[PDB]
Amino acid sequence: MEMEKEFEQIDKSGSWAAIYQDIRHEASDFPCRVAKLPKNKNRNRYRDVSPFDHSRIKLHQEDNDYINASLIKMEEAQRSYILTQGPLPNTCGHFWEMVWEQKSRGVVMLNRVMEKGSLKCAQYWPQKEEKEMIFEDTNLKLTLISEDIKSYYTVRQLELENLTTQETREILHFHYTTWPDFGVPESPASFLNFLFKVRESGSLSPEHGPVVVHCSAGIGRSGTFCLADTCLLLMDKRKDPSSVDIKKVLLEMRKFRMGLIQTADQLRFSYLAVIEGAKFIMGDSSVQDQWKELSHEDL
Secondary structure, eight states, X not given: XXXXXXXXXXXXXXOXXXXXXXXXXXXXXXXXXXXXXXXXXGGOSOTTOOOOTTTEEEOSOSSOOEEEEEEEEETTTTEEEEEEOOXXXXXXXXXXXXXXXXXXXXXXXXXXXXXXXXXXXOOOSOSSTTSOEEETXXXXXXXXXXXXXXXXXXXXXXXXXXXXXXXXXXXXXXXEOOOOSSSOOSOOHHHHHHHHHHHHTTTTOTTSOOEEEESSSSSSHHHHHHHHHHHHHHHHHTTOGGGXXXXXXXXXXXXXXXXXXXXXXXXXXXXXXXXXXXXXXXXXXXXXXXXHHHTTSOO
């Protein structure tokens, strides 16, 4: 694998910091005028993380159509993703409106509500079946239907109802709960096991709207997830580990949202994940059972 060759020689020369800086230097720069409007100041979690105007998701609203979210549309792979920040106490209604309007089937969450002693995300879904949530501003109802808790991730089945038309849909929530407070989980096995769980659910299928992916800012962990998935899909489409260039794929993704992949360590982990995942893509079906064991999801 030309990918694994580059990997071992970047490691050898210990130059991840420099490779990653090269990415930042070459990455696209597009305007984020709407995000920066004064009326939107309280709709942004971080002053330095904003969606580009050309790729932002627009809420179907008369008043204010803004949410901090970007459509990543990957032309060759034929897969789309919505990347967004962790919802704020005042944007949970906007978040679920987006899920409804875009026809998403799945939501992927890669952070915990509290990390490093501060609040990284609002509690935007119900924790108990009997205590449903109503978002008055967007007129939507949200109910916990069931929860399956494993050692490092939790899958929830939710029912989202448009209170206006009374139509209902099932949304699947995939919550990765074990990304370490500091520095990447540097075995990819549990990450890959999680990604394949999302794929098996049908949430990534062309028949549904784009999956919604978020962490706290919606660029680091979220970027890692989407980069690994897209690279694996490309290798699958041409069944050719060799033609896929991770750095080129990441730069393509950065055309649609800024700052994807936040550290050199996250880039190195992305390589690791793709390389290990390639084993399955190329015919070794048995490798998936190995990941599931390596990531003791029962403890």
